[PDB]
Design a protein around this ligand. Structure first.
Ligand SMILES: *[C@@H]1O[C@H](CO)[C@@H](O)[C@H](O)[C@H]1NC(C)=O
Ligand SMILES: *[C@@H]1O[C@H](CO)[C@@H](O)[C@H](O)[C@H]1NC(C)=O
Ligand SMILES: *[C@@H]1O[C@H](CO)[C@@H](O)[C@H](O)[C@H]1NC(C)=O
Ligand SMILES: *[C@@H]1O[C@H](CO)[C@@H](O)[C@H](O)[C@H]1NC(C)=O
Ligand SMILES: *[C@@H]1O[C@H](CO)[C@@H](O)[C@H](O)[C@H]1NC(C)=O
Ligand SMILES: *[C@@H]1O[C@H](CO)[C@@H](O)[C@H](O)[C@H]1NC(C)=O
Ligand SMILES: *[C@@H]1O[C@H](CO)[C@@H](O)[C@H](O)[C@H]1NC(C)=O
Lengths: 595, 201
């Protein structure tokens, strides 16, 4: 009779129809992804169309229930998720123009071909060739040519597109009662209505700032060390007092520093912990790799894989005749159906990735009891964080000695720990200032703090001030240097990586104190510990029903992002970097002294 | 005494077509000799939980009428076919009394009730004004009036069709695969009990 009971009945009908239609959409997407054929393309398009039309009409019927008279938190959360207008709030012409702009940005990024002048007979694409030339080459002018050419072409073809994109997204967010599009993206972390666990959209930026201020000393030492090693690579081009040249960061954009392990190795004489040879000698097929990951997950106490998982997942590349997407993806199709799309190779990297995707599947499996619209992570960071903790635990020497990949006579001295921690630092600590800088630039450009004709000058200045990376040559407003990255060009939130990185080490400390680990954090394994699995599964079972602050309090006993686990993880590497940066200068200057 | 005139349990358990849980099928069994050996012999059973009588002494204690109720539900709801339970199936589709004397039998039926396109021929009642009484069926297709405005027979806002389809597919998880359930309810009346098991000598 009341509004709340009407909302509950409406949500029951929505949940049944949503799970059926979502299952059909997910099955069609799976059939396209494992079998790239045009009938599968049109089937996936038809199912996606029916799903999008279904959510459009259900949101239209859902906005007839006002939220101010609903007291149950779960029903209020489901209705808040359902009643979001999205892009529908605009006029049909502006919405169509926005979708056209997003599609053409996607096609420009996917089909962007940049090649050498005077040799136009064939040209090289970004994903096959530019990644290889950015990650493997040691030539300064070659990397400069690739970097400047790609940014020049992509920036000139994408700058007015981004110019219209910021205005259209800003109008969409302000029509949706948000301050800006950055506020719309920060709304994923917003918690309202729960006493003590309340989290605002506005608070996130200072929280990120508060974490980054403590990130900054460790990164500075790492930056100094990397600079010194790059001085060995490039003798005269890099200055001791200045920033790093932008096209020397090992990637196209400087997002990851993991390609510099060869140049910046602490101890090249020491071997690595690569166990690929042990797999190929013992004939470890992909099925048994996933079986080992399942054994790890049942050691910690989580439930094992379903029978339908083993029957329906395609864990091996099918062949030349059948084309499939090779990207590792964990699929929650709904209705108890969980699959992994992975073209497994017999390597340690695929083994760790299998652990990561099975962590994704376990996270999806735990919240199956939740209502359909609450079947997600509590925020965007948790879902990747719970897979990255499995990737952390599986990569330890203790776990590799446990399952027979690593010999019991392997000596774990401090030098291999230092080089392993430096590899982890180049992957993890390296991406944090880039992520925070990119998100903060996007937040100010959506907010209007940055003037329209001052974008590049502001962006490069922050790259000098935050990341400590200098541009090779000055760029004017004909360029759109942020837009060369995949996430910004295709309308993706980027702060999930920063929050995921913090939540990863927070969860790792919570599980390691749960499992009674008496050593350094990077050696810790959560195997054979039921209590750590129970502590994690308490968060996994909630899904999106509870605030992310409450889920974090359930795991780590804190309701806010903490950077102390991450610095505690990298503590011996931090002491080592402090030791060997005595001769070098820690910190950078914003001047263009290197170039 | 020779053994003949066995009760038709083949008709109930081995039927080619079961019924939806909203219109659950009820078959009365009388004037025959019921042997429970065949049921116990059958391996695929997911639940053989019995209430009020032991499964071992089914063949000797004997009753006046035996009711076999057959329907198809999803695996997650098999726990709801019990006395004292709540859910969609218990409240709106099939209710057992708190003093239920009988057995519930359930088994997986993927090979018979799952279709790749989706089997949309199994239905259940999702909305009903009041809970079902024990051993009651509701086959009405009246539009559920959830609000204050009259439905007038047309669905829409705050007016939902109560029967929703169990879209069974072979790739579903074990909690969502189709399960065939047969409920045996035994009753004694003032009439002479004529459903009695076999005799040995
Ligand atoms: C993949 O699609 C092709 C389309 O011609 C079909 O013949 C083939 O059976 C499909 N593969 C599988 C495993 O179903
Ligand atoms: C909210 O609704 C759910 C069912 O929709 C119920 O289980 C829960 O107890 C309700 N919470 C409160 C606080 O009433
Ligand atoms: C969604 O857009 C409609 C169209 O005007 C509006 O009436 C409604 O209030 C919007 N919903 C929200 C949550 O802003
Ligand atoms: C999962 O584990 C249970 C017991 O721990 C076992 O009965 C079941 O067979 C396992 N699943 C598979 C697919 O083997
Ligand atoms: C490793 O430990 C030995 C033990 O004295 C020490 O001499 C050496 O400097 C340490 N090396 C590193 C990289 O910590
Ligand atoms: C976990 O338990 C199994 C079975 O008892 C054992 O073989 C394995 O060595 C254990 N793992 C560790 C790291 O001790
Ligand atoms: C059903 O068919 C099977 C097939 O062999 C048979 O063994 C069984 O006795 C039949 N009856 C019942 C009640 O299962």
């Amino acid at each position: 009779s009341t509004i709340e009971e009407q909302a509950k009945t409406f949500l029951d009908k929505f949940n049944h129809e949503a799970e059926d239609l979502f299952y059909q959409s997910s099955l069609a997407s799976w059939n396209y992804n494992t079998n790239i054929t045009e009938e599968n393309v049109q089937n996936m398009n038809n199912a996606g169309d029916k799903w999008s039309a279904f959510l459009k009409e259900q949101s239209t019927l859902a906005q007839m229930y006002p939220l101010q008279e609903i007291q149950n938190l779960t029903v209020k959360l489901q209705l808040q998720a359902l009643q979001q207008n999205g892009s529908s709030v605009l006029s049909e012409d502006k919405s169509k123009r926005l979708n056209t702009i997003l599609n053409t940005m996607s096609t420009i990024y996917s089909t962007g071909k940049v090649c050498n002048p005077d040799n136009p007979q064939e040209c090289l694409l970004l994903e096959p060739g530019l990644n290889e030339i950015m990650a493997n080459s040691l030539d300064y002018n070659e990397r400069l040519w690739a970097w400047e050419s790609w940014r020049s072409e992509v920036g000139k073809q994408l700058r007015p597109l981004y110019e219209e994109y910021v205005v259209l997204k800003n109008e969409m967010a302000r029509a949706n009662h948000y301050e800006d599009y950055g506020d719309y993206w920060r709304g994923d972390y917003e918690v309202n209505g729960v006493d003590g666990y309340d989290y605002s959209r506005g608070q996130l930026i200072e929280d990120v700032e508060h974490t980054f201020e403590e990130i900054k000393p460790l990164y500075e030492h790492l930056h100094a060390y990397v600079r010194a090693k790059l001085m060995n690579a490039y003798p005269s081009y890099i200055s001791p007092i200045g920033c790093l040249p932008a096209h020397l960061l090992g990637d196209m954009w400087g997002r990851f520093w993991t390609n510099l392990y060869s140049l910046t190795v602490p101890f090249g004489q020491k071997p690595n912990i690569d166990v690929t040879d042990a797999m190929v000698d013992q004939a470890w097929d992909a099925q048994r790799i996933f079986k080992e990951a399942e054994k790890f997950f049942v050691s910690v106490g989580l439930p094992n894989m379903t029978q339908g998982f083993w029957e329906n997942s395609m864990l091996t590349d099918p062949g030349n005749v059948q084309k499939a997407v090779c990207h590792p993806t964990a699929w929650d199709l709904g209705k108890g159906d969980f699959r992994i799309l992975m073209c497994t190779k017999v390597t340690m990297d695929d083994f760790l990735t299998a652990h990561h995707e099975m962590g994704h599947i376990q996270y999806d499996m735990a919240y199956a009891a939740q209502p359909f619209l609450l079947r997600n992570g509590a925020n965007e960071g948790f879902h990747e964080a719970v897979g990255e903790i499995m990737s952390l635990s599986a990569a330890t020497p203790k776990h590799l000695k446990s399952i027979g990949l690593l010999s019991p006579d392997f000596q774990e001295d401090n030098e291999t720990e230092i080089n392993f921690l430096l590899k982890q630092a180049l992957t993890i600590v390296g991406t944090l200032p880039f992520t925070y800088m990119l998100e903060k630039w996007r937040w100010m450009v959506f907010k209007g703090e940055i003037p329209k004709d001052q974008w590049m000058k502001k962006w490069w200045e922050m790259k000098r001030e935050i990341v400590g990376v200098v541009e090779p040559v000055p760029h004017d407003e004909t360029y759109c240097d942020p837009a060369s990255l995949f996430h910004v060009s295709n309308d993706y939130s980027f702060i999930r990586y920063y929050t995921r990185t913090l939540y990863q080490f927070q969860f790792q400390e919570a599980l390691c104190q749960a499992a009674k680990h008496e050593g350094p954090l990077h050696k810790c394994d959560i195997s054979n510990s039921t209590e750590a699995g129970q502590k994690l599964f308490n968060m996994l079972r909630l899904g999106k029903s509870e605030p992310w602050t409450l889920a974090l309090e359930n795991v780590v006993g804190a309701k806010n992002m903490n950077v102390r686990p991450l610095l505690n993880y990298f503590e011996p590497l931090f002491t080592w970097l402090k030791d060997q940066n005595k001769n070098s200068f820690v910190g950078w200057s914003t001047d263009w002294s290197p170039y | 005494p020779n053994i003949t005139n066995l009760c038709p349990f083949d008709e109930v358990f081995n039927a080619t077509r079961f019924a939806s849980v909203y219109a659950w099928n009820r078959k009365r069994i009388s004037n025959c000799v019921a042997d429970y050996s065949v049921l116990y012999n059958f391996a695929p059973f997911f639940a053989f939980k019995c209430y009020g009588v032991s499964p071992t002494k089914l063949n000797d204690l004997c009753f006046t009428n035996v009711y076999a109720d057959s329907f198809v539900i999803r695996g997650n709801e098999v726990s709801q076919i019990a006395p004292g339970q709540t859910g969609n199936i218990a409240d709106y589709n099939y209710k057992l009394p708190d003093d239920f004397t009988g057995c519930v039998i359930a088994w997986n039926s993927n090979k018979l009730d799952s279709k790749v396109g989706g089997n949309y021929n199994y239905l259940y009642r999702l909305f009903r004004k009041s809970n079902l009484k024990p051993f009651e069926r509701d086959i009405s297709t009246e539009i559920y009036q959830a609000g204050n405005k009259p439905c007038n027979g047309v669905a829409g806002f705050n007016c939902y069709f109560p029967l929703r389809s169990y879209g069974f597919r072979p790739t579903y998880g074990v909690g969502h695969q189709p399960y065939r359930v047969v409920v045996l309810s035994f009753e004694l009346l003032h009439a002479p009990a004529t459903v009695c098991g076999p005799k040995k000598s």
